[PDB]
Design a protein around this ligand. Sequence first.
Ligand SMILES: Nc1nc2c(c(=O)[nH]1)N=C(CO)CN2
Ligand SMILES: Nc1ccc(S(N)(=O)=O)cc1
Length: 282
Amino acid sequence: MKLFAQGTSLDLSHPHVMGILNVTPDSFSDGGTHNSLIDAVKHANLMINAGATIIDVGGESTRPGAAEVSVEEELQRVIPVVEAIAQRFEVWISVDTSKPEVIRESAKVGAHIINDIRSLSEPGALEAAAETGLPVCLMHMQGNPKTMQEAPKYDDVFAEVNRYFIEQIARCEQAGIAKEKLLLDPGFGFGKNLSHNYSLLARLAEFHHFNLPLLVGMSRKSMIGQLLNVGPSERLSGSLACAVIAAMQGAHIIRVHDVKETVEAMRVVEATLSAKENKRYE
Ligand SMILES: Nc1nc2c(c(=O)[nH]1)N=C(CO)CN2
Ligand SMILES: Nc1ccc(S(N)(=O)=O)cc1
């Protein structure tokens, strides 16, 4: 199973570690792109050296209570970073944005994947994505990402995620985006309580019925912090366990903050699955 973008390919035969590079106004400080660029390129370098095969560049925070970012603010931070990395390294670059101008401007500087947690729901996003012909990640979410509001109720969270996926795949094809260009992500922590999150992880293997790559992001999330009752900087062990459970079930891309450690853990999973008559646990 491979992805094709920007004259290159990504083989999904093994788990890939996607490192996170957030370049928001509150971190990519001192205003409209400071010498925070060296910082970003430095940070990327470490991630690559640690074994990341994909880097997720985002100019907007999607945490509860997060501010909205303007197209200008976003453009100012993401584009320069995407370009500097594309020019310097061979990694795959995914862009975490929901804005059509950022989508368009990103393809042009070499981005390989459009990771929109909003699944191209913003006016003009679907059309901008299609035009680029790049792979798109579709994520399940109930509500507004940045709501300090409570988690919905679900009749059955897994059935709802499944049906959402069917509907979104359809929407994409109707717009020109071939099913073969999609990645699916259940969206851990988004409009889901503790129970819902562990139900989605327990049954991850059942989402293979779509025959599409699966991307997951549990790193330092609430589903861990709540369970173990620990702060954000004390969640590495839990984070690692979630990555292993997902990978063991055949997830293809794991979004994380702790690249080195996850890569090691993934090396153990690969050794195991290769000795496993059918390459996956269910
Ligand atoms: N594809 C994907 N992208 C994300 C995800 C996630 O869970 N999956 N979680 C986030 C948390 O701010 C940010 N971006
Ligand atoms: N939505 C969200 C909440 C917390 C985090 S974390 N893992 O940086 O604490 C990431 C995304």
